[PDB]
């Protein structure tokens, strides 16, 4: 299992996914049948956590961690501030 589980340093989690050798990779993705130079959103961030590592009960606990990861401010959305969603392709933040 990945070097994480679920309670790993939120900042450490986002950092991992960012790593070009994590599995998710945040820089290039596909959506709507197009190609973007920076996409992932909580949706992908999740599929990764669960994929790369694990520890969450189910899709619930999983989505719970991802959301908590975004709120922390480790992710950037296109809304008022952040407010997780996992629907509108987003990009890490800082």
UniProtKB/Swiss-Prot annotation:
It comes from the Eukaryota. Disruption phenotype: Mice display abnormalities in social behavior and sensorimotor gating. It is found in: Cell membrane; Cytoplasm, Cytosol; Cytoplasmic vesicle. Residues 20-94 form the DEP domain. High levels are seen in the brain, testis and kidney, lower levels in the ovary, breast, muscle, liver and small intestine, and very low levels are seen in the spleen and thymus. A moderate level expression is seen in the heart. Ubiquitinated; undergoes both 'Lys-48'-linked ubiquitination, leading to its subsequent degradation by the ubiquitin-proteasome pathway, and 'Lys-63'-linked ubiquitination. The interaction with INVS is required for ubiquitination. Deubiquitinated by CYLD, which acts on 'Lys-63'-linked ubiquitin chains. Participates in Wnt signaling by binding to the cytoplasmic C-terminus of frizzled family members and transducing the Wnt signal to down-stream effectors. Plays a role both in canonical and non-canonical Wnt signaling. Plays a role in the signal transduction pathways mediated by multiple Wnt genes. Required for LEF1 activation upon WNT1 and WNT3A signaling. DVL1 and PAK1 form a ternary complex with MUSK which is important for MUSK-dependent regulation of AChR clustering during the formation of the neuromuscular junction (NMJ). Belongs to the DSH family. The DIX domain promotes homooligomerization. Interacts with CXXC4. Interacts (via PDZ domain) with TMEM88. Interacts with BRD7 and INVS. Interacts (via PDZ domain) with VANGL1 and VANGL2 (via C-terminus). Interacts (via PDZ domain) with NXN. Interacts with ARRB1; the interaction is enhanced by phosphorylation of DVL1. Interacts with CYLD. Interacts (via PDZ domain) with RYK. Self-associates (via DIX domain) and forms higher homooligomers. Interacts (via PDZ domain) with DACT1 and FZD7, where DACT1 and FZD7 compete for the same binding site. This is Segment polarity protein dishevelled homolog DVL-1. The lineage of its organism: Eukaryota, Metazoa, Chordata, Craniata, Vertebrata. The gene is Dvl1. The chain holds residues 406 to 499 of 695 of the full protein.
